[PDB]
Design a protein around this nucleic acid. Structure first.
Ligand code: ADP
Length: 641
RNA sequence: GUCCUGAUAGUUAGUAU
RNA sequence: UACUAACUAUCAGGAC
């Protein structure tokens, strides 16, 4: 059951938004989704009506795939309207005009990603004259060449009576580092782009009392890294000798070995960093994993790096002999096993999480890390430590979550996630049987997670938005926010925290009424260096400078050729300097042999290589359409056998 | 499970003016 | 302040 009775500030915000374009700024849990749903319900009298003579429909936009299901479910639950869902997996590329028209006629509210909406707009399937309300989710992304900004260019050229109402939702207006004197400039730029107003609640005290009364308490904890033990210094000396002999080999290096020797250099640096930050046991684990993963890579490699791997195995042997020698006397020595930072983290856990476990209360906690290897190793260590049936560690169950779709061009990284397993892990966390989670900045925003009693910043935030979001994650009663900082950087972090506090104070000051943008402010929209290509006038499909290379690559890919060869186009550059005293770049392009066009194509002289490439792609698109490889809708020809 | 193309954010070096 | 080259974290769209 939802809160049928709205709060007074919700009603005030709805009344304000019904009049003009507005952007709502509120903290998490205020209920911005409820406001959006209510606004959709209010204007429901313009939606019903056939689409073949001038009907209108309402659109919703999001950033990530999982949010589609959440928002569709919320809308379907709270109100009784037909709702559709569309993402990039159903192969919506191959649809024709008739299928799109049928879908538009059948539904009343649509929820799709931004890229799909842009693709629909560019190819002439909708003219933006049949939209009654358009909603931006996480509106603070509209900067530079983001799809949100490219959508507004079509809004720019419309008439006065065709303009649909625009609404946006956000939590932090700024999205990057900003000294306290640039906040007004950033806010004005954002307001100019979206052509709306930034407003907040006039009863923010009531909102804070009702919901934000669970505001977390900040605690700063310091640690010192110059407390290495005898094992640490012994291993450090071992790596020192190893890097000395490696430098000797680099002095005696030759061709086809400098790259290999640099690979050994980076491996040794990684090992040293892991040992310094985490401790000896993690170094042992990483060395063993590196051996087991390089076991498969032994084939078709030069003998010199086999010898290097042999000496690496020798250092493995000596270090494991030393580790066993101490283990014969350590008997699971906690202080020697881990670095000082891990000891401090363990102390914090005992101080707060175990103490809460002593009381009859539920436990939920998250740990934020920067890299991915660190998250994996921390989960391994915590599980291993809890497995020993310790008195204080028998109630801690740990799992980790890493970003999907984040496959690099290398570093398979020992069971990368890159799949739907995020859904399974999050379902585990919501259901129960998991109190502690390790996350590499992937659950920060736009995901439903349960209330957490404790949040730990194992690493420092990098800008205002990250700090605000991570602070807002914790919402349970008596929640605590903890930041761990080295000793020598305390003053620098204190200055940065003061800056963040000042920015937050200015943002709250913004609560007062603000002047609406003038028409010239909207006219301050920048223009691209070259105009688009409209073959059928202003109402037809277009090709833009920012949507040409991808289209060319798609057309090349759909060519009939061998499945083992992509046959992508190739590019070259030529540089020249003219009397403007700024170096000029001119690009060039060539097509694969399969396409009917075999001729070099040259773009305009452009200041940067990016723009030269874009110009060449645009000219190639022109030449392709003139020949007849693209249909009436500027799509690749869909001829099939 | 592979192989391409775009978008945003932090750091390092060289180079203007 | 603009350009060139490396490293780290996140997202979307089409091929086999
Ligand atoms: N009328 C209401 N007033 C306040 N809170 C409400 C109301 N109706 C529902 N809620 C609750 O507020 C929560 C808002 O969720 P969500 O949209 O994620 O927060 P936010 O809008 O801050 O992102 C919902 O989980 C819902 O249970």
């Amino acid at each position: 059951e939802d809160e049928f009775t709205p709060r007074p500030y919700q009603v005030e915000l709805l009344e304000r938004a019904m009049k003009k374009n507005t952007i709502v700024c509120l903290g998490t849990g205020s209920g911005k989704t409820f406001i959006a749903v209510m606004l959709i319900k209010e204007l429901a009298h313009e939606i019903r009506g056939p689409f073949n003579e001038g009907g209108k429909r309402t659109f919703f936009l999001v950033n990530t795939v999982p949010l589609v299901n959440q928002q569709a479910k919320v809308i379907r639950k709270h109100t009784s309207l037909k709702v559709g869902e569309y993402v990039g997996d159903m192969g919506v590329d191959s649809w024709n005009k008739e299928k799109w028209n049928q879908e538009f006629e059948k539904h009343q509210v649509l929820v799709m990603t931004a890229q799909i909406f842009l693709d629909i707009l560019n190819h002439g399937f909708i003219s933006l004259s049949q939209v009654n309300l358009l909603i931006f989710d996480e509106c603070h992304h509209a900067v530079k060449n983001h799809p949100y900004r490219q959508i507004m260019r079509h809004y720019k050229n419309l008439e006065q009576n065709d303009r649909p109402r625009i609404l946006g939702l956000t939590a932090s207006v700024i999205n990057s580092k900003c000294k306290p004197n640039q906040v007004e400039k950033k806010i004005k730029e954002l307001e100019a782009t979206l052509n709306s107003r930034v407003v907040t609640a006039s009863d923010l005290e009531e909102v804070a009392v009702q919901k934000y009364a669970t505001k977390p308490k900040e605690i700063i904890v310091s640690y010192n890294s110059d407390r290495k033990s005898d094992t640490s210094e012994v291993i450090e000396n071992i790596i020192n000798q190893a890097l000395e002999q490696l430098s000797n080999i680099e002095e005696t290096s030759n061709l086809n070995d400098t790259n290999s020797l640099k690979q050994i250099k980076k491996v040794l640096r990684d090992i040293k960093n892991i040992l310094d930050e985490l401790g000896p046991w993690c170094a042992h684990r990483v060395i063993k994993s590196r051996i087991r993963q390089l076991e498969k890579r032994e084939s078709e490699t030069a003998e010199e790096l086999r010898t290097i791997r042999e000496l690496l195995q020798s250092i493995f042997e000596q270090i494991i002999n030393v580790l066993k020698n101490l283990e014969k006397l350590q008997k699971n020595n906690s202080v020697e096993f881990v670095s000082p930072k891990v000891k401090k983290l363990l102390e914090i856990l005992k101080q707060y999480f175990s103490n809460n476990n002593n009381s009859s209360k539920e436990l939920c906690g998250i740990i934020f890390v920067e890299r991915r290897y660190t998250a994996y190793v921390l989960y391994k260590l915590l599980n291993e430590l809890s497995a020993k049936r310790d008195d204080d560690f028998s109630f801690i169950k740990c799992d980790f979550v890493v970003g999907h779709n984040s496959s690099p061009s290398s570093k398979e990284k020992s069971t990368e996630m890159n799949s739907k397993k995020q859904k399974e892990v999050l379902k585990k966390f919501r259901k129960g049987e998991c109190n502690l989670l390790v996350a590499t900045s992937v659950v920060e925003e736009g995901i439903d997670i349960p209330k957490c009693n404790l949040v730990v910043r194992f690493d420092l935030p990098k800008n205002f938005r990250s700090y605000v979001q991570s602070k807002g994650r914790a919402r349970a009663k008596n929640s605590k926010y903890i930041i761990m900082v080295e000793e020598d950087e305390k003053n620098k972090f204190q200055e940065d925290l003061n800056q963040y506090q000042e920015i937050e104070k200015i943002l709250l000051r913004l609560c007062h009424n603000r002047d609406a943008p003038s028409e010239e402010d909207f006219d301050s929209f920048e223009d691209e260096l070259l105009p688009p290509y409209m073959p059928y006038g202003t109402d037809g499909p277009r090709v833009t400078m920012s949507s040409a290379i991808s289209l060319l690559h798609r057309y090349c890919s759909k060519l009939p050729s061998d499945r083992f060869t992509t046959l992508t186009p190739k590019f070259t550059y030529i540089e020249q300097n003219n009397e403007e005293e700024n170096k000029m770049f001119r690009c060039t392009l060539r097509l694969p042999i399969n396409s009917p066009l075999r001729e070099p194509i040259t773009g305009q002289p452009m200041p940067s290589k990016k723009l030269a490439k874009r110009s060449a792609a645009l000219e190639a698109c022109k030449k392709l359409h003139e020949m007849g490889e693209l249909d009436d809708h500027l799509l690749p020809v869909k001829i099939s056998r």
